[PDB]
Amino acid sequence: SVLQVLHIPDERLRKVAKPVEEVNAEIQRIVDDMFETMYAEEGIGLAATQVDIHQRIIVIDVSENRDERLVLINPELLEKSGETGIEEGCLSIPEQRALVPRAEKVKIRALDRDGKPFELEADGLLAICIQHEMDHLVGKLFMDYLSPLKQQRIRQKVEKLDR
């Protein structure tokens, strides 16, 4: 089913997720609900933290046709290099976008939806989305890289939006 996505200012967005202990049927349900939610919001990534589930689970699909499901359970950053940035959005910060510094390339290791370990080297948009989603799992939001004043204007506009 489609889950509720938390919006700033909600302190549960700052919670640090626990590792997943075993990828069982219940973990797979969460994964599937996460995709359903992400797609319904027209998103390209979602972290469990954003739907009040405090486990290290991320779903991503950067494809136009919404048929390239990437699941990152207990993701681990092995290496990163370069610098880049684009104007990022976030499902928990509606209608607000800002350029944020990110690594250009990342190499990560994670478990997939079957619990199988894999490694992934990503650049471009996918690398940026990976970093954005991993930030969520440690209670970090893209606005945290901006000036205290930008953060204020963003805080003020989301709060007025969710009227």
The site for Co ion (CB under 5 A) is made up of 90
By CB under 6 A, how many residues form the interface with ligand H2S?
5
Binding range to ligand H2S, per CB under 6 A, among 22-30, 39-47, 119-127, 150-158: 39-47
Residues 76-95 that bind ligand H2S (CB under 6 A): 90-91
Rounded to 5 degrees, φ, ψ at 80 are: -150, 160
| Binding track over 112-151 against ligand H2S, x by CB under 6 A | ----------------------------------------
User: What is the C-alpha to C-alpha distance for residues 154 and 71, in angstroms, rounded to an integer?
Assistant: 30
Instruction: Tell me how far, at minimum, the Cβ of 89 lies from Co ion, in Å.
Output: 8
Q: Is the distance from CB of 56 to CB of 70 less than 8 angstroms? A: no
User: What is the C-alpha to C-alpha distance for residues 47 and 132, in angstroms, rounded to an integer?
Assistant: 9
Binding site membership: which residues? 90, 132, 136
130, interface contact from Co ion, ligand H2S, none, CB < 5-8 Å by kind: none
Conformation bin of residue 113: beta by default, left when phi > 0, alpha when psi is -120 to 50:
alpha
CB-based contacts of 31: which residues, under 8 Å, 6+ apart? 57, 59, 71, 73, 113
Kindly tell me which of 17 and 91 has the beta carbon lying closer to ligand H2S: 91
The site for ligand H2S (CB under 6 A) is made up of 43, 45-46, 90-91
